Amino acid sequence: ATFEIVNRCSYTVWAAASKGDAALDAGGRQLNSGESWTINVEPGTNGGKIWARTDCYFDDSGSGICKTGDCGGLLRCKRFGRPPTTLAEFSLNQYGKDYIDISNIKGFNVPMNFSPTTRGCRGVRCAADIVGQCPAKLKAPGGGCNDACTVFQTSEYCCTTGKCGPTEYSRFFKRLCPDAFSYVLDKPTTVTCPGSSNYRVTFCPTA
């Protein structure tokens, strides 16, 4: 499947793509304002994620650091990134269907639209100014808006026991972005697409 990753932000981002234990495609790449990067993701990819990283510095070998979404200091991510990270999430060719969503469960750093480029389903979007409106205790000094689990490490926020309800913090993410997961047991906003759909992830889709 193809994922066109587009940076409409006025600032450079470093796109990242991983399924947790491996890179997807090259795993990461710099995207200046306006640039597009098309990757190929193997059919059947389960638990894939795409995100943006901000304020990165990498050396010649592709080692360095990002202020949000850093994946073990690598330009080419093999692992998931350090919160806060707005997450485009997907599992492909699962009994004939693709499943996509956006998640704020690991916080928010960059606004995002996640849409099919092929027919048969709708896209999802979280493009509200979550960083600007972020509750004081959730603000990440490094940039972005942390989820409450990341900040407070409680069973309730992290849904450790598999029992948890919505919280004041999760309700903030849900208020600004109704179409993204705000906590682990949120009412699913997952979209069912035809198996083997193709997609576009757009950072800052409205700016």
UniProtKB/Swiss-Prot annotation:
Q: Does the keyword Disulfide bond apply?
A: yes
Q: Which UniProt keywords apply?
A: Cytoplasmic vesicle, Disulfide bond, Signal, Taste-modifying protein
Q: What is its main location?
A: cytoplasm
Under the heading InterPro entries, the entry gives: Osmotin/thaumatin-like_sf, Thaumatin, Thaumatin_CS
Tell me yes or no: is Signal among this UniProt entry's keywords.
Answer: yes
GO-annotated cellular components: cytoplasmic vesicle
Q: What does this protein do?
A: Taste-modifying protein; intensely sweet-tasting. It is 100000 times sweeter than sucrose on a molar basis.
- In which family does this protein belong, per the annotation? Belongs to the thaumatin family.
**Name by which UniProt lists this protein:** Thaumatin I
- Species per Swiss-Prot/TrEMBL record: Thaumatococcus daniellii
